[PDB]
């Protein structure tokens, strides 16, 4: 919790320290285009970044500075990159409405998820690395079995584009946010909407869940940051 890494639209990668209250390192040429997605391994030593240059770049933390490790160039622009909690899988979303799964250790291709009509915006993997969720602009959430890539169920969750979906830690339940300014609580096993949260006045751009899962934080186009606490 002492450092923060930022990915800009200009292709630059920035790192900050809270104690120093200043920017330590900036990588101007991290990517030729916007670094749309950024994910970290569980160990925290390897960084994964997705950009509009159609490449995924791996970086290492050495004492602190970043060094580019390997480049994975894809056929299309990348929207989201997610690393499984076990660090065994790497899921990437493409504008072509397909999500590609890779093996993090060897970078061998594993699965090609298909069935989204519009590009997938967010990807999230269950704590047990069994279930994976894909949310796209087509207003649908699809839950897939990572063993064979099979869509267990497709849910018409929201009335507009769904930007972020997150698993609750140690459980298959998950949250979802969309441009309709509604946050919905779901059951990963029964596939039912547990609760609907109507507090946002506008589009909900980001969502995050606490490591313990006690509370959830959502921010929207109304400049409002609110904390949803489990009671």
């Amino acid at each position: 919790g002492l450092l923060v890494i930022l990915g800009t639209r200009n292709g630059e990668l920035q790192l900050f320290d809270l104690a120093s209250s200043s920017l330590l390192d900036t990588i101007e040429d991290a990517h030729d285009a916007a670094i749309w997605s950024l994910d970290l391994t569980s160990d925290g030593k390897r960084l994964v970044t997705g950009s509009a240059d159609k490449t995924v770049k791996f970086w290492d933390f050495k004492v602190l500075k970043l060094h580019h490790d390997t480049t994975l160039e894809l056929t299309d622009d990348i929207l989201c990159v997610r690393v499984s909690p076990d660090d065994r899988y790497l899921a990437i979303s493409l504008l072509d409405n397909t999500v590609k799964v890779f093996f993090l250790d060897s970078m061998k291709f594993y699965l090609s998820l298909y069935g989204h009509k519009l590009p997938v915006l967010s990807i999230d993997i269950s704590f047990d690395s069994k279930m994976i969720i894909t949310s796209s602009a087509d207003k649908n959430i699809k839950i897939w079995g990572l063993d064979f890539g099979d869509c267990h169920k497709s849910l018409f969750a929201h009335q507009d584009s769904i930007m972020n979906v997150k698993f609750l830690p140690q459980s298959h339940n998950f949250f979802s946010c969309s441009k309709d300014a509604v946050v919905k609580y779901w059951d990963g096993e029964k596939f039912e909407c547990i609760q609907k949260l109507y507090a946002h006045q506008s589009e909900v751009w980001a969502l995050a869940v606490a490591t313990d899962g006690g509370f959830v934080v959502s921010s929207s186009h109304d400049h409002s940051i609110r904390i949803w606490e489990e009671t």
Binding site: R9, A34, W36, A52, D77, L79, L95, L118, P119, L121, A137, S161, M163, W205
Partner: peptide
């Protein structure tokens, strides 16, 4: 569509 527009 524009990639910047749809997500942001």
């Amino acid at each position: 569509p524009d990639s910047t527009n749809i997500k942001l």
